RNA sequence: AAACUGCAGUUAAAAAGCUCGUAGUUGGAUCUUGGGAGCGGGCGGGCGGUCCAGCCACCGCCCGUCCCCGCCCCUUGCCUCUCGGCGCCGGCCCGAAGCGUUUACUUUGAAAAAAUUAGAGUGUUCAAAGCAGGCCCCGCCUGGAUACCGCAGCUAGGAAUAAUGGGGACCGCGGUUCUAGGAACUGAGGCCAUGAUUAAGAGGGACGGCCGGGGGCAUUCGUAUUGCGCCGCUAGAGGUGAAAUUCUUGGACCGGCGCAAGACGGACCAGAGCGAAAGCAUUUGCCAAGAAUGUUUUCAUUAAUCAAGAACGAAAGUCGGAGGUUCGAAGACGAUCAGAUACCGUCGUAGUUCCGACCAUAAACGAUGCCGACCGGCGAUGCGGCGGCGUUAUUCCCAUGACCCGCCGGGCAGCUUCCG
């Protein structure tokens, strides 16, 4: 059965990216998914998206720009201290000039560079470059 | 695929134990099955009695045949063939003498060396053959 | 493949798709007013009825359940509601 | 895929006494003390091959940082027009390598050759100047470079960078 | 797909987006409730009660009209079922198969089907004990099942 | 450990017949992020008043504020513990002085032997070492250092994530006052009920009309084969490469009529259908079960995978009964040409059939774990549903169909393909 709605959302965006699609439909929606998509949009990787309100868990239609190489999830959500952050960057991100790791911290959901500025750790959600 | 759950340490530990036992090097090292595998019974050298000189008794002047001797190891009674390093070191060795034997030929066999001989003579009467050849020591009787 | 707008499907596209596969789910069933023959009382009947519906006035059989839709008796008139 | 099939197809097809006496005899470079390159200096210019970039991605190795770990010195990777063209011909599947190659710290140098074959271009630059280090994982290219005196070779062994004919290696892996 | 059967199907109900009672419906919340009380005293399950109201009285959803579910309405009035409806029907089916199987020893297929039905009973009973609908000593027995339903 | 992750499982070593199923592992979305009412002050726009036209004079209304800033008020509750009651029959009611989430995670702070290690200073004549401040006829030069120290136990800041928590559109009784039957105050009982939202293109159940060589019990038909009785006719019949054992003038074989027994279910029969697999085919009746489809019915997470454990498992075979047509391992007879051309003929034991107990194996194949998501076109095909220009039959019962076209689901299979 389905156990990770964020994993399914990221995989479908990844596959639509490879096939040259301009729009992708992901269901079900989730506030974790919306927060993750917002982080990707601020760095210019996806673009604007729409949340469709049915009375059962929602759907999202996402516009695609063609700039995405790889988006993925990390399972299980490992606990990441600030001292461990550099090791995770080298394992998941090919370059130090682009790509981000998305964390869920007690101050909110942010990218790993923002987490270092706020001096906070948390749990790892995924990555994109 | 294998389990990638957060609470799966016990399952992962059992897999690594099984993988260790499939390693033939790990089993042999921990069970001690091959401690006595080598012809010297786990030692680096051995002592033997010089039986007779096969190369000299035959009249071939090859000088690769001539430096082969037969010795019997004291520890287990096996009979082996060893090399004398140089022709003229045969003169220092007599029959029924006690010699020290080391291994030879793990790297390989040179041109002009007989394949299948894996031993060499190093000492006679606890004196190195090179010292006797160079005239630095005398053989005690 | 053909280029479709996922955000703006046409009316012909959504009425053709399966009811669970639309952007927002919607049933294909409806309620109707049926007028009994012999006495002209009006009865509200579900389109995909699973029970035999009797006229309240005279207990006349108005419909009989089938696999997909209830078949109506001869001589009655019906109107969709809403 | 047929990208694989076309590649293997391409590699298969890849394999009087009065007159003045005139002859071209190139001079031995003054930079070399026999087999030792003295003018090779702590700022190292390294010519990067296209397959070196891809295998650095597979081994999770940053280009500039891993070269500095090997040499303990400032290193300047260099990209030719021939090498940049081959990355572009690979397609969207290799877009990550293309972005890495266009890095402002990298040295972008032009070349006016006939053809795109980058093994020939890199050998020619090695013959001309003797100031570069060649970073590649290609075996037959390494055989050609070994015939040219005074030019070190950088390669990947285990999950680290390694150097071949350089006396000032310092922080280089042991066996 | 199905928990035991290999097939997977998509046939189900699709509720409308709009949750409001239509204007043409002339029944009140109180009028619907007395209809529910009348049919329950006739010996009808909550699933069957909702079917009757939809087909004849034009009540598409009792929950939208009264604000409460049918089982919740019956429980408040005091007409609660002794056993949950889905569990009750499963026990009834197991009794029918076991009665058939005692007269037909050679029906291997019926013996196989009986095992599947009892597995669903165990799964359903375990869930109901955790929710404290059933006492934490209730057990399903073949001889006891006949008296249970 | 020299050259958070081992490499693989169609054909190269290998995924084990099938389903259920325990421990372990992993689990959809949302909420727990309060409500009110009036007076002020700023800010903008306009009008008017008083004084004798006003920066150099005071007052007062009105409209608005992307929208600021004050000032007050409601936030329900519960009886597990404790402290109480001047309350009712050990039980109950009540006020509380009682309770009204916890943890994981992350970032701190304490407390935690030296030596070793990292690291700062210092001409042992250098180095390996060693050492642990100096100056002045208070005062200066500097800081003779410092860092680390798993988990668990203490400590306190944090919004996310994940666990955990989250009344009757009823009944009978009293008491006190004010009035010509009325009203207003008030006091204790009895039953039932006690719950965060939604309704997953998650799952279970119910309901409706269908559908299928799916299963079990009984019933029934059809030729054929074998045996028997009678009739007609008269020398051969059988079998093979060729023959020979065998049967026949007391009539074989062949033709006709009738009777009995045991098996079997052709053609229609399809790459169609059903079942977890092994497997499943004459008519009719009965018993229980099931997939898919239809649904504006119901429950509300009840789920996935699974060592242990359990049910089933072609053919052959073993044990005990009942039968025995056909075929037939074994065995006995008759022959044994061609030939790398290579296993016949007659009789036929056990078996093949049925009812019970075992046995648990197949090239028991896609030589290919399961669940979920994503990822091209084109037509047919089986079942169910919806819409339809027209043909074709028609309905006491039985029944509302046959063909053609478009669409939607889940199946059995195909033709073509991009990337991988
Ligand atoms: Mg090349
Ligand atoms: Mg259904
Ligand atoms: Mg969740
Ligand atoms: Mg804390
Ligand atoms: Mg549903
Ligand atoms: Mg049927
Ligand atoms: Mg059937
Ligand atoms: Mg006769
Ligand atoms: Mg006859
Ligand atoms: Mg037939
Ligand atoms: Mg059998
Ligand atoms: Mg048998
Ligand atoms: Mg028998
Ligand atoms: Mg088979
Ligand atoms: Mg298999
Ligand atoms: Mg079918
Ligand atoms: Mg059809
Ligand atoms: Zn009527
Ligand atoms: Zn070039």
From Swiss-Prot, chain A:
Compartmental location: Cytoplasm; Nucleus, Nucleolus
Cellular component aspect of the GO annotation: cytoplasm; cytosol; cytosolic ribosome; cytosolic small ribosomal subunit; extracellular exosome; membrane; nucleolus; nucleoplasm
Known disease link: Diamond-Blackfan anemia 20: A form of Diamond-Blackfan anemia, a congenital non-regenerative hypoplastic anemia that usually presents early in infancy. Diamond-Blackfan anemia is characterized by a moderate to severe macrocytic anemia, erythroblastopenia, and an increased risk of malignancy. 30 to 40% of Diamond-Blackfan anemia patients present with short stature and congenital anomalies, the most frequent being craniofacial (Pierre-Robin syndrome and cleft palate), thumb and urogenital anomalies. DBA20 inheritance is autosomal dominant.
Check the UniProt entry and state the signal peptide residues, or none.
Answer: none
State what protein this is by name.
Small ribosomal subunit protein uS8
Question: Keywords, A to Z?
Answer: Cytoplasm, Diamond-Blackfan anemia, Nucleus, Ribonucleoprotein, Ribosomal protein
Task: Describe its partners and assembly state.
Answer: Component of the 40S ribosomal subunit. Part of the small subunit (SSU) processome, composed of more than 70 proteins and the RNA chaperone small nucleolar RNA (snoRNA) U3.
Q: What's the encoding gene here?
A: RPS15A
Q: Which family does it belong to?
A: Belongs to the universal ribosomal protein uS8 family.
PROSITE patterns given in the database record:
RIBOSOMAL_S8
Recorded coiled-coil stretches: none
Under the heading InterPro entries, the entry gives: Ribosomal_uS8, Ribosomal_uS8_CS, Ribosomal_uS8_sf
User: PANTHER family given for it?
Assistant: 40S RIBOSOMAL PROTEIN S15A
Residues with the modification N6-succinyllysine, per the entry, are 87
Top-level taxonomy: Eukaryota, Metazoa, Chordata, Craniata, Vertebrata
- Tell me where on the tree of life, at the top rank, the source sits: Eukaryota
Pfam families linked: Ribosomal_S8
Chief localization:
cytoplasm
GO term, biological process aspect, one: cytoplasmic translation
Swiss-Prot record, chain B:
**Modification type N6-acetyllysine: residues:** 134
Please list the residues that carry the modification 3-hydroxyproline. 61
* Record's keyword annotation contains Aminoacyl-tRNA synthetase: no
InterPro entries of this UniProt entry? NA-bd_OB-fold, Ribosomal_uS12, Ribosomal_uS12_euk/arc
Q: Specify the cross-link site (Glycyl lysine isopeptide (Lys-Gly) (interchain with G-Cter in SUMO2)).
A: 36
Residue ranges for the region (Disordered) are: 1-25
Pfam families in the record, alphabetically?
A: Ribosom_S12_S23
Which PROSITE patterns does this entry report, sorted A to Z?
RIBOSOMAL_S12 (PS00055)
For the keyword Ligase, the answer is no
A single Gene Ontology CC term: cytosolic ribosome
**What's a single GO BP term from this record?**
maintenance of translational fidelity
Give the subcellular location: Cytoplasm, Cytosol; Cytoplasm; Rough endoplasmic reticulum; Nucleus, Nucleolus
A single GO molecular function term of this UniProt record: structural constituent of ribosome
Q: Which UniProt keywords apply?
A: Acetylation, Cytoplasm, Deafness, Disease variant, Dwarfism, Endoplasmic reticulum, Hydroxylation, Isopeptide bond, Nucleus, Ribonucleoprotein, Ribosomal protein, Ubl conjugation
Q: What's its job?
A: Component of the ribosome, a large ribonucleoprotein complex responsible for the synthesis of proteins in the cell. The small ribosomal subunit (SSU) binds messenger RNAs (mRNAs) and translates the encoded message by selecting cognate aminoacyl-transfer RNA (tRNA) molecules. The large subunit (LSU) contains the ribosomal catalytic site termed the peptidyl transferase center (PTC), which catalyzes the formation of peptide bonds, thereby polymerizing the amino acids delivered by tRNAs into a polypeptide chain.
Under the subunit heading, UniProt states: Component of the 40S small ribosomal subunit. Part of the small subunit (SSU) processome, composed of more than 70 proteins and the RNA chaperone small nucleolar RNA (snoRNA) U3.
NCBIfam families registered for this protein in UniProt: PRK04211.1 (NF003254), uS12_E_A (TIGR00982)
Name the family the entry cites: Belongs to the universal ribosomal protein uS12 family.
Q: Which gene encodes it?
A: RPS23
UniProtKB/Swiss-Prot annotation, chain C:
Tissues and organs where the protein is expressed, per its UniProt entry: Expressed in a wide variety of actively proliferating cells and tumor tissues.
**UniProt-annotated location(s):** Cytoplasm; Nucleus, Nucleolus
The record's region (Disordered) falls at 1-22
Q: Where does Zn(2+) bind?
A: 36, 39, 55, 58
Query: What GO CC annotations are associated with the protein?
Result: cytosol; cytosolic ribosome; cytosolic small ribosomal subunit; GABA-ergic synapse; glutamatergic synapse; nucleolus; nucleoplasm; nucleus
In which residue ranges is the amino acid composition biased (Basic and acidic residues)? 1-15
Zinc finger boundaries on the chain: C4-type: 36-58
Entry's Gene Ontology BP terms? cytoplasmic translation; ribosomal small subunit assembly; ribosomal small subunit biogenesis; rRNA processing; translation
Keywords, alphabetical: Cytoplasm, Diamond-Blackfan anemia, Metal-binding, Nucleus, Phosphoprotein, Ribonucleoprotein, Ribosomal protein, Zinc, Zinc-finger
Looking up SUPFAM superfamilies in the UniProt record yields:
Zn-binding ribosomal proteins
- Tell me, what is one Gene Ontology molecular-function annotation carried by this entry? RNA binding
Tell me how the cofactor is bound. Binds 1 zinc ion per subunit.
Q: Which residues cross the membrane?
A: none
Cofactor(s) needed: Zn(2+)
Sorted alphabetically, which InterPro entries does this protein's record hold? Answer: Ribosomal_eS27 (IPR000592), Ribosomal_eS27_Zn-bd_dom_sf (IPR023407), Ribosomal_zn-bd (IPR011332)
Positions bearing Phosphoserine = 10
Indicate the disease this protein is implicated in.
Answer: Diamond-Blackfan anemia 17: A form of Diamond-Blackfan anemia, a congenital non-regenerative hypoplastic anemia that usually presents early in infancy. Diamond-Blackfan anemia is characterized by a moderate to severe macrocytic anemia, erythroblastopenia, and an increased risk of malignancy. 30 to 40% of Diamond-Blackfan anemia patients present with short stature and congenital anomalies, the most frequent being craniofacial (Pierre-Robin syndrome and cleft palate), thumb and urogenital anomalies.
Its name, as the record gives it, is Small ribosomal subunit protein eS27
UniProtKB/Swiss-Prot annotation, chain E:
Q: Give the matching CDD domains.
A: Ribosomal_S15p_S13e
* Protein's recorded name: Small ribosomal subunit protein uS15
- Family indicated by similarity: Belongs to the universal ribosomal protein uS15 family.
Q: Which GO terms describe its molecular function?
A: mRNA 5'-UTR binding; mRNA binding; RNA binding; small ribosomal subunit rRNA binding; structural constituent of ribosome
What does the subunit comment say?
Component of the small ribosomal subunit. Part of the small subunit (SSU) processome, composed of more than 70 proteins and the RNA chaperone small nucleolar RNA (snoRNA) U3.
Species, as recorded? Homo sapiens
The UniProt PTM text for this protein says: Ubiquitinated at Lys-26 by RNF14 and RNF25 in response to ribosome collisions (ribosome stalling).
Query: Phosphoserine modification sites?
Result: 29
Q: Where is this cross-link: Glycyl lysine isopeptide (Lys-Gly) (interchain with G-Cter in SUMO2)?
A: 42
Q: Which UniProt keywords apply?
A: Acetylation, Cytoplasm, Isopeptide bond, Nucleus, Phosphoprotein, Ribonucleoprotein, Ribosomal protein, Ubl conjugation
PTM N6-succinyllysine: list the residues.
26, 33
Where found, per UniProt? Cytoplasm; Nucleus, Nucleolus
GO BP field = cytoplasmic translation; negative regulation of RNA splicing; ribosomal small subunit biogenesis; translation
Superkingdom of origin organism: Eukaryota
Please give the InterPro entries that the UniProt record associates with this protein: Ribosomal_uS15, Ribosomal_uS15_arc_euk, Ribosomal_uS15_N, uS15_NS1_RNA-bd_sf
- Note the SMART domains from the entry: Ribosomal_S13_N, Ribosomal_S15
| Residue numbers carrying Phosphotyrosine | 37
Which GO terms of the cellular component aspect does the record hold? cytoplasm; cytosol; cytosolic ribosome; cytosolic small ribosomal subunit; extracellular exosome; focal adhesion; membrane; nucleolus
